Design a protein around this ligand. Sequence first.
Ligand code: COA
Ligand code: COA
Ligand code: COA
Ligand code: COA
Ligand code: COA
Ligand code: COA
Ligand code: V55
Ligand code: V55
Ligand code: V55
Ligand code: V55
Ligand code: V55
Ligand code: V55
Lengths: 244, 244, 244, 244, 244, 244
Amino acid sequence: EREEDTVRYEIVNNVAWVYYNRPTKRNAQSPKLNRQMLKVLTELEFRDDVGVLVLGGEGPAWCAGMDLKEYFRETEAEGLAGTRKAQREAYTWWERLRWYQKPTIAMVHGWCFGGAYGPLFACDLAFAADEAQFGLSEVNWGILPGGGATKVAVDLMPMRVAMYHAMMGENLSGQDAARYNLVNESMPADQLKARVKQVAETLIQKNWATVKYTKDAVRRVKEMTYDNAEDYLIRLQEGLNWFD
Amino acid sequence: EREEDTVRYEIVNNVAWVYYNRPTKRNAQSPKLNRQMLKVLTELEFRDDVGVLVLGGEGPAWCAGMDLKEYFRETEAEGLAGTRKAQREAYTWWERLRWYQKPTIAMVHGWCFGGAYGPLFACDLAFAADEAQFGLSEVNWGILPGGGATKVAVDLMPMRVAMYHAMMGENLSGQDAARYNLVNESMPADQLKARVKQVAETLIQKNWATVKYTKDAVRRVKEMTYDNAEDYLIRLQEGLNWFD
Amino acid sequence: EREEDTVRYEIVNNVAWVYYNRPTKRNAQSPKLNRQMLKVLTELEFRDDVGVLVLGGEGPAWCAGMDLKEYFRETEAEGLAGTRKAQREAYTWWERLRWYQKPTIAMVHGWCFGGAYGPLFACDLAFAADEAQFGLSEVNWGILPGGGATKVAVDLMPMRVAMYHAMMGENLSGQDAARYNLVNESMPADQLKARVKQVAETLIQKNWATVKYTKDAVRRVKEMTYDNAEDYLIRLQEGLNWFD
Amino acid sequence: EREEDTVRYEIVNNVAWVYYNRPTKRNAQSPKLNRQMLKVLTELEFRDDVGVLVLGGEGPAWCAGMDLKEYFRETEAEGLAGTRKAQREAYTWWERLRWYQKPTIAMVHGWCFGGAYGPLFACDLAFAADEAQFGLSEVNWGILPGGGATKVAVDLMPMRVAMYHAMMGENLSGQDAARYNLVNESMPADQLKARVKQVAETLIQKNWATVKYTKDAVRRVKEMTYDNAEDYLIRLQEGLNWFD
Amino acid sequence: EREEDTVRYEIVNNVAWVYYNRPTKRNAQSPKLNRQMLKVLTELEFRDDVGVLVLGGEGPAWCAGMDLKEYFRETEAEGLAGTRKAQREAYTWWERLRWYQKPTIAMVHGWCFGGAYGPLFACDLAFAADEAQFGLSEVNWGILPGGGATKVAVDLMPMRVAMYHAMMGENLSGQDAARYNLVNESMPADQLKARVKQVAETLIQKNWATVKYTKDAVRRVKEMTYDNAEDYLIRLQEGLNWFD
Amino acid sequence: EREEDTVRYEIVNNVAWVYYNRPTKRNAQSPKLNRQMLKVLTELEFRDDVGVLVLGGEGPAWCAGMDLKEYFRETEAEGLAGTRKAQREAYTWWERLRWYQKPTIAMVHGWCFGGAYGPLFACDLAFAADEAQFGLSEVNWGILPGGGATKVAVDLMPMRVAMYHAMMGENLSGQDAARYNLVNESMPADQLKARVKQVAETLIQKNWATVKYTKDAVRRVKEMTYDNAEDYLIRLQEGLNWFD
Ligand SMILES: CC(C)(COP(=O)(O)OP(=O)(O)OC[C@H]1O[C@@H](n2cnc3c(N)ncnc32)[C@H](O)[C@@H]1OP(=O)(O)O)[C@@H](O)C(=O)NCCC(=O)NCCS
Ligand SMILES: CC(C)(COP(=O)(O)OP(=O)(O)OC[C@H]1O[C@@H](n2cnc3c(N)ncnc32)[C@H](O)[C@@H]1OP(=O)(O)O)[C@@H](O)C(=O)NCCC(=O)NCCS
Ligand SMILES: CC(C)(COP(=O)(O)OP(=O)(O)OC[C@H]1O[C@@H](n2cnc3c(N)ncnc32)[C@H](O)[C@@H]1OP(=O)(O)O)[C@@H](O)C(=O)NCCC(=O)NCCS
Ligand SMILES: CC(C)(COP(=O)(O)OP(=O)(O)OC[C@H]1O[C@@H](n2cnc3c(N)ncnc32)[C@H](O)[C@@H]1OP(=O)(O)O)[C@@H](O)C(=O)NCCC(=O)NCCS
Ligand SMILES: CC(C)(COP(=O)(O)OP(=O)(O)OC[C@H]1O[C@@H](n2cnc3c(N)ncnc32)[C@H](O)[C@@H]1OP(=O)(O)O)[C@@H](O)C(=O)NCCC(=O)NCCS
Ligand SMILES: CC(C)(COP(=O)(O)OP(=O)(O)OC[C@H]1O[C@@H](n2cnc3c(N)ncnc32)[C@H](O)[C@@H]1OP(=O)(O)O)[C@@H](O)C(=O)NCCC(=O)NCCS
Ligand SMILES: COc1cc(C=O)ccc1O
Ligand SMILES: COc1cc(C=O)ccc1O
Ligand SMILES: COc1cc(C=O)ccc1O
Ligand SMILES: COc1cc(C=O)ccc1O
Ligand SMILES: COc1cc(C=O)ccc1O
Ligand SMILES: COc1cc(C=O)ccc1O
């Protein structure tokens, strides 16, 4: 219903805990959530009291993907302009998170489906509950894994695993999502918040600028030859010398 | 001896079971097999009663690579024109399978060596017998892993694993080929046909056009930046809207 | 102190055993070691009695990265010319090893930190002691993982693993470095020299030219599309036909 | 003064004629202009009566670059948050223009410096007056040609010409701009509008969907191998068959 | 009528002069011509008395594009199988030409439209008459410039020029084609054959193996970084040392 | 005879005028010249009184390519070790020049053949006399255009022009070299030095750090997508803000 109620956050000891807040809608990404998520991310990004951002979810789902009703059906009733406006709101906040000034952590306690793979990839690190389920179910409602989700599967998991995942639309457990490197680690649900909290506290003790440059370098040198990446990392360090 | 006897198939319930059929020659890819495989693949590809193609082998080998006598020795006796004609027949059917209209499955019960890595990679999914052996033995007869096999090892397995595999010419078991993601899964031989049959039946229940676009997207977005892959998947879905 | 004492070697039965020789300095890469390593590598490379090169270390470390005093502090006191001259000495011997005429093996018994990742990557194969520790500690002294180390982590390990490794500056054990494919294998320290010796003896029994072309092809086809890699491997084999 | 006055537009014969509207400030790109350009472009893009958009300038400038006061000095005063907010507003409208639903034409009658190169490249076609002047004067102000302006130079002009243009900070005339393919055509100032009207009028008589898929194809296949581009153009036509 | 009559050739002074042979149909590419061109090219390629191949056209056309009746309408009538069979026949002969063993020359005396761009690009060199006309008229028929023709435009001509050529569907004269480097040279129709004879005659006096490795190098190093291209050209010369 | 005499230089108004100094041997690149060029370049690069380096030639040649006696015949006599040692010495100084700290200008008054293309490309700008001659005569000697010379042709000139240049081994005049953008400008021999002095003199009046970051940007963004290039140029300016 209300746009500013679709995302909630709390800053505690330099950690921004951000939650998808449509628990009864399995935190489906609707245009209202997409717009409000950008608003919250943009406001938190450069605060000197935010060193780490954790993306969680309320209720049994982390994120059940895009809102079938509000993101797909309602926007397409407004024609191409409607579809484009809605796509842009989704892609824009996933990119804001992907290139965030502060280190980002996905805390995935529950269902992570489809369009949730953009935000999952956009988090630098990811920690899952054993009980979590990850799935590209798009094939199972007759569409391509969109919102970059095909590329997310290919950039994080081995090619055979990614192909099975996208084609068969079966779910991975938390432990399988760790084995195939969709996430960093899986543990029982009741240890997950303590582990994420520990990782956040470790990052805030490092030099914040050094952490920003390092996470960026990791994502960027993926799309370079070894030779070009060598020179790139020298130019980055000259940038960090200015910021530090 | 006879060109049309080097490959056999059977279509049962929308699954094309295709077998390398030179069991006494460990299903060596000879020019006769290469030509006949293209003929069989081309005829099956667009039949409305074929939803999935399974590539198996007769006898103890899946495929022991290229025929040393008929593919290498005899063709090179015909000079460059002979070598080129033979190369083209091999590369052409591997590409036909790589970009097949229908989902493809490798059922690897036995030996998979050398030139078999092109067809193995060209199958979207791969299931192995624990007893199967995978090897790049080229180094062990003084040649580079050709027919794209070096690239197959690098595109599916981690770089260190690929380097050991190509340089040392040692065999991986089925279970090791699963661990290193050369295949999706390994199981005892006597469960392998039941598992492959189950996977085929699951794919034929999906929208066939959606499965084609998804498998293609997986292979294609490997060779794109994240940013270019995002737009690509939007253009693909517009294509699928036309086909569906 | 003395430049020619910072690296030692011994050739036994066609294996060059090369050691970082600053044990009391945890084999820190100083400009003296960088210069002497290039001298030793260049002299060994084309000897007909050297078929394999093993890179080890004296004392408890394999390589604790760059010498904080002699590589960073002292060179930067000589301004940009000093920094550039020192960088060039490091990058040049890592590249000499990366593209070496003979197969290369890292025997990592102990600490491998930071700037050691260039040489580790430049070795074709890598074998670790269970007791070995691998770490990008740069973040923990406020710099980017330089000397290509970010790219090394991204080229060998899965993206999530690489991101955690670079951002958190925690150590991987030998067994974890094997699991994540930073190295080929981990075993107890007291088996490591016997295993490396076995692998070296296996490579020297192969055709030396075939091993050189294969290791190069593995590294090169990483940075090509599948289609361009297919043609590339044909051109390489024409090159090997000339050398053999 | 007023954000809403920094851009104006008129629709004539289903052509949107859009103008930088800060003539006394040489249509420098201020945050106000950047936010208003985005608004205007977003509002016109999916209008069924707008077939083509022309970007022009009031006064003796087309666009003299970024506003050195409002984009650089005033935003840096607000530290990194202010700089990033201002960069995002600039990059976002250049990108909206670069991927516009409708064909785009730059009508360059006068000065085109520095940050104007983004918008210049983001236009599909570009027609200059002979008395127009194009330059990357960045080097003379002691900064790199930013806002992608160095890449615009390298993507449009021969590498020697881009190198001279960027390093010497000297202006190209409309005639030289046309010679080095920064623009399509140069003509006397008094023929410029009529040629642009003619071109816009020819485009509007084509299938609008076809012109959109074509201009996107041209831009995209530049960052693709020939082989990948052949498949891509088939995927695109499948898309267009849905959209027509 | 007859498939065998759609292409003719004559060998003169070890030059194969090959001609599109449907002059009354403006040498449009029908499936029949596509299958016969492949046959002819395959048969001439490894003849020890053919040093060079020239592609020409009978009648006022070089090639007016794909046969709108036989390639598009008649094949779509046979649904997707028919379309794919017809596309494969076109793409396959363009590719055979693009990677030909012998140097290739387009002799463009008249019309060169649309699908003719494949064969145009597949020729290593291209000489036009001044009265020749080149265009991508696709946009005026409401389709994308397919058959790789959009990539041919972007690969040969400056991006502004490719953009105008593709979007406006207007023709370039032989003189403008030469100016924008779609062809090497333009000359009056009555000098065309003599210049082509001269060029073919100069090529045949070179080491044929050297000319083949050189034209392939030029085409390949375009899709390589400078650094990767330096190593590649050394690998190529090792190949040529085997082949000479 | 003497290694130290193969290169000379004079500093005038903070411009290093460096000359190939084997005029009787058409400044062919011998190992001696290769080792001495590196020495000279390394020694001048970080001098606070050298703002610009110009590369010229004594005698009627700029550089006629590699010394066929000292670089090819004498080194091959020492087998593979000798060939690799000689290649490394050539490639190493071209690279030092290509990434020089100071802006670089080729002053091409006469012959520029084959292996001279490395140094030609490694210069940021290039000014030719009208009576200069440029060619890849490699094909006429039966070798591929090596030393990256084929890539230099493809990177600087339109693909048709590179193809003709490489395949026909015919010379371009200074005027045609300027037309196809192998050099910036061509002028009568007696105006050449004065234009070069003027250009070097304009560069020295700029912020030297800005000119270095700019010329490197131009070279680097050519091997980047537009999207990756936009981010890269921001990272570079952060670097320059440290260095200024
Ligand atoms: C996530 C899921 C497994 C949770 O199951 P559950 O806990 O049993 O929840 P239910 O589906 O019974 O109901 C949850 C509510 O959220 C809604 N919902 C769940 N996923 C949704 C989605 N992706 N979009 C919109 N609404 C969604 C349901 O319609 C229901 O709303 P309602 O009760 O007011 O009608 C299940 O809802 C699901 O499969 N979601 C779809 C996932 C998907 O296909 N994603 C693709 C988008 S890219
Ligand atoms: C696959 C293999 C392990 C099976 O071993 P096996 O079951 O004991 O079979 P054998 O080798 O004893 O004999 C099988 C028959 O197939 C032939 N054969 C096996 N692999 C072959 C190959 N790659 N090419 C041609 N013939 C082959 C053998 O010559 C023999 O023919 P014959 O009995 O009529 O002379 C073994 O044949 C082998 O190593 N093959 C070579 C694999 C290879 O090097 N591939 C590289 C090609 S890219
Ligand atoms: C490798 C290491 C764990 C070994 O610990 P240890 O066995 O307890 O050794 P210590 O640090 O107590 O002392 C070893 C000696 O080597 C020196 N040393 C260790 N690593 C060094 C490095 N990277 N550069 C320079 N000197 C180094 C120490 O200063 C000490 O010298 P000293 O006793 O003469 O003063 C530890 O030395 C270390 O953390 N090294 C730094 C690793 C690093 O940060 N690398 C980044 C460079 S890219
Ligand atoms: C166009 C130019 C070459 C000379 O033209 P001119 O007709 O003499 O114009 P002027 O320099 O007198 O114009 C100055 C006025 O325009 C404004 N102006 C021009 N370019 C501006 C810019 N880039 N940023 C902010 N204001 C600018 C000034 O604020 C000033 O206002 P004023 O009239 O109150 O003094 C000169 O204005 C110029 O070099 N501008 C900057 C170009 C540049 O470096 N662009 C790249 C930036 S990314
Ligand atoms: C060349 C051209 C500009 C005018 O030349 P012209 O001398 O007036 O030629 P015509 O148009 O009278 O030629 C028509 C005849 O050629 C045939 N023809 C020409 N181009 C053809 C094509 N692309 N497909 C099929 N047939 C074609 C027609 O079947 C017709 O046969 P007909 O004589 O029995 O009527 C015109 O033929 C043309 O535009 N052709 C199509 C160009 C094109 O769009 N190519 C891209 C396709 S990928
Ligand atoms: C410049 C050229 C076209 C004719 O110019 P010219 O004024 O007639 O010069 P000459 O051929 O008489 O010069 C010959 C002398 O220069 C030397 N020379 C010229 N080019 C040389 C080269 N590439 N390698 C070694 N020596 C060379 C010869 O050793 C010879 O010495 P000599 O005077 O004792 O006989 C001719 O020298 C030439 O083609 N050179 C080689 C060009 C080439 O192929 N370069 C590519 C190599 S990568
Ligand atoms: C078809 O469009 C989309 C699909 C998805 C997830 O599969 C996410 C966002 C989209 O806009
Ligand atoms: C050397 O040529 C080939 C090698 C291989 C397998 O290693 C496969 C096909 C070939 O044409
Ligand atoms: C900041 O420069 C460097 C960093 C490193 C390792 O992190 C290695 C070599 C370098 O020159
Ligand atoms: C240094 O920042 C910028 C520079 C430019 C043009 O030089 C354009 C936008 C920017 O944000
Ligand atoms: C839309 O299909 C095609 C188009 C073209 C040229 O526009 C060439 C071959 C094709 O198959
Ligand atoms: C074949 O080796 C070379 C060739 C060239 C130029 O053709 C330059 C340097 C080389 O090492």
